[PDB]
Design a protein around this ligand. Structure first.
Ligand SMILES: *[C@@H]1O[C@H](CO[C@@H]2O[C@@H](C)[C@@H](O)[C@@H](O)[C@@H]2O)[C@@H](O[C@@H]2O[C@H](CO)[C@@H](O[C@@H]3O[C@H](CO)[C@@H](O)[C@H](O)[C@@H]3O)[C@H](O)[C@H]2NC(C)=O)[C@H](O)[C@H]1NC(C)=O
Ligand SMILES: C[C@H](N[C@H](C(=O)O)[C@@H]1CCCN1C(=O)c1ccc(C(=O)O)cc1)C(=O)N1CCC[C@H]1C(=O)O
Ligand SMILES: [Cl-]
Ligand SMILES: [Cl-]
Ligand SMILES: [Zn+2]
Length: 575
């Protein structure tokens, strides 16, 4: 009756755990040891997973979900009927598995070489060049070189990947793969919701862009910077211009205020990756949240290992037995990686909070929620006060404040258009409005229209700049990070009120608030069990996504930018 459904979900649950546990293992062993062997064993455990999905997913398809009374079991069964790639016929499944492997690998082993000099990798070499060099020509060398070797090299596999991920979405009942992705939020009004959210951030973003443009004009000179045109995409301190905080020192509002490079100070005081994660764990436990188990310290890879190996992109790992969780990060000892550690630590925290739900229901209330936990804590960590107490700053005034808000704005506000544009591009690739004759040009339309950037070198057929960003070859959806950046402010705003904080939201530090831990924990325990507005409502007292907490956090900076931009006559925007 209803009792065959009960028995099925029970059985899918027990067998999931085993097969997922074995595949997590092999997937780890390869990400920390790119070989042809580990390559194999994984392409192997991929088959086993696929066959477990096909068999439970076939059975789930046989139940009429209409007729189910139990809401939890309805929801599990509905989700298991989505086989994903396992829906592909054997040949294409094999081809698709090969393509993704080849895209990841290509991206991860790319190097940019000086002629008769030596060869730079993405992490940490090209990252450091992008972060610290202040020579137009050196930045251009790294920016173009990366697109030339990672970008172009992905172009050969993308149309084939597109057809396969589309085929699988069709055979699971969606129209294309972007439709499939959008459905993880169960929110039919999503595109307009995000559009509305994006439009509310424009005044802050335009104001920051104009102010930074003026600062680059001053450093790199009038012949290199059009004061009414887009910013050249290689001057923002980051490979993708997706965060700008590495150029903080070109744009300091109040340089007469005392300041310490945090990065400078961590190095002096002999901080290690271990310390960075220990600090993050301490922040989690200060709120009454879970510590990572002892196993996590034994088993994680928290630095690039030394013995000539690895996938360096930071990621968090659930191994699906509720005891083994891990992080794999090639940590640099800087502020940027300290934030990243917090980010990954929040994914770990979610894994532990939801470890007792059925597996099908082990996900964020929405993917945006999974992305926001670590970030919320890190907004507290980043406060001057908190950093003072870490012995990483000297630490008052209106001046110090604006400076601080400007550091934050170079991370949070600048990323808003970036994080928005990625899936706008991919959605259009998936639904077939953009073709391989068009990939790059349409990537540039979006970079220009949302971010107000231009390529420093004309692009030519043969370029595929999207493949130069990790999530594109690895096929990881990106809109999550846009949702994250909005909702992390809302959460931060709510946790500050729970914690008894008063006055300006950007002074809040929720370290050691047990009230704040409780809101988060009950939200995270829900997993993917309830529509996400219910978790929003638990954390924040209402159920909608809203820009107003972000706007209100940055409100002093927006007043400052307007006054400053107006003094100088800035024309906000670009043509
Ligand atoms: C609809 O069915 C759900 C899910 O049922 C659970 O999974 C099924 C496949 C069956 O195997 C059931 O045996 C199993 O209960 C019901 O949800 C579950 O409700 C119970 C309360 O009976 C929750 O249990 C709690 O568990 C903790 C420790 O784990 C205890 O401290 C609590 O005191 C309590 O016993 C259980 O967590 C919950 N399961 C999930 C995953 O949500 C659900 O109640 C049912 N709806 C109704 C009212 O019919
Ligand atoms: C470095 C951060 N890395 C990602 C990430 O952590 O999101 C990595 C790679 C892809 C996802 N990821 C996870 O570790 C992760 C693991 C599991 C889950 C889940 O189980 O639900 C979700 C994510 C990132 O890319 N970021 C972080 C912020 C901005 C974005 C970027 O750098 O472009
Ligand atoms: Cl680009
Ligand atoms: Cl997403
Ligand atoms: Zn993440």
């Amino acid at each position: 009756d209803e009792a065959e459904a009960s028995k099925f979900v029970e059985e899918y649950d027990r067998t999931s755990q085993v097969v997922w546990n074995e595949y997590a293992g092999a997937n780890w062993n390869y990400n920390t040891n790119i070989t042809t062997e580990t390559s194999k064993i994984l392409l192997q455990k991929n088959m086993q997973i696929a066959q477990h999905t096909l068999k439970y997913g076939t059975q789930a398809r046989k139940f009429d979900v209409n007729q189910l009374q139990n809401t939890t079991i309805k929801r599990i069964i509905k989700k298991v009927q989505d086989l994903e790639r396992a829906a592909l016929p054997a040949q294409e499944l094999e081809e698709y598995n090969k393509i993704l492997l080849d895209m990841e690998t290509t991206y991860s082993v790319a190097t940019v070489c000086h002629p008769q000099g030596s060869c730079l990798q993405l992490e940490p070499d090209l990252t450091n060049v992008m972060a610290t060099s202040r020579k137009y020509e050196d930045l251009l060398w790294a920016w173009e070189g990366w697109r030339d070797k990672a970008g172009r090299a992905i172009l050969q596999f993308y149309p084939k990947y597109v057809e396969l991920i589309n085929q699988a979405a069709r055979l699971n009942g969606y129209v294309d793969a972007g439709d499939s992705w959008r459905s993880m939020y169960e929110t039919p009004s999503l595109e307009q919701d995000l559009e509305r959210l994006f439009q509310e951030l424009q005044p802050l973003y335009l104001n920051l862009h104009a102010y930074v443009r003026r600062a680059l004009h001053r450093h790199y000179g009038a012949q290199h910077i059009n004061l009414e045109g887009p910013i050249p995409a290689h001057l923002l301190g980051n490979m993708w211009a997706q965060t700008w905080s590495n150029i903080y020192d070109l744009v300091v509002p109040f340089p007469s205020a005392p300041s310490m490079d945090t990065t400078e100070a961590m190095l002096k005081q002999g901080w290690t990756p271990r310390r960075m994660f220990k600090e993050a764990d301490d922040f989690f436990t200060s709120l009454g949240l879970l510590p990572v188990p002892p196993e996590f310290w034994q088993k994680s890879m928290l630095e690039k290992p030394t013995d000539g190996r690895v996938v360096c992109h930071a990621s968090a790992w659930d191994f699906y037995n509720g005891k083994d969780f891990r992080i794999k990060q090639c940590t640099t000892v800087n502020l940027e990686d300290l934030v990243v550690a917090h980010h990954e630590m929040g994914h770990i925290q979610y894994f532990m909070q939801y470890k007792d739900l059925p597996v099908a229901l082990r996900e964020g209330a929405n993917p945006g929620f999974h992305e926001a936990i670590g970030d919320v804590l890190a907004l507290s960590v980043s406060t001057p006060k908190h950093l003072h107490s870490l012995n990483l700053l000297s630490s008052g005034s209106d001046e110090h404040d604006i400076n601080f808000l400007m550091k934050m704005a170079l991370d949070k506000i600048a990323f808003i258009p970036f994080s928005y544009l990625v899936d706008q591009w991919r959605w259009r690739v998936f639904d077939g409005s953009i073709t391989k004759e068009n990939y790059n040009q349409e990537w540039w339309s979006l970079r220009l229209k949302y971010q107000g950037l231009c390529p420093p070198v004309p692009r030519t057929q043969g370029d595929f700049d999207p493949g130069a960003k990790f999530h594109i070859p690895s096929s990881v959806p990106y809109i999550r990070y846009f949702v994250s950046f909005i909702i992390q402010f809302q959460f931060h705003e709510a946790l500050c009120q729970a914690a008894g904080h008063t006055g300006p939201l950007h002074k809040c530090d929720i370290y050691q608030s047990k009230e704040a831990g409780q809101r988060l924990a009950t939200a995270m325990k829900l997993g993917f069990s309830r529509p996400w507005p219910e978790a929003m409502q638990l954390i924040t007292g209402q159920p909608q996504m809203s820009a107003s907490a972000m706007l209100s956090y940055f409100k002093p900076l927006l007043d400052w930018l307007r006054t400053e931009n107006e003094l100088h006559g800035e024309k906000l925007g670009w043509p």
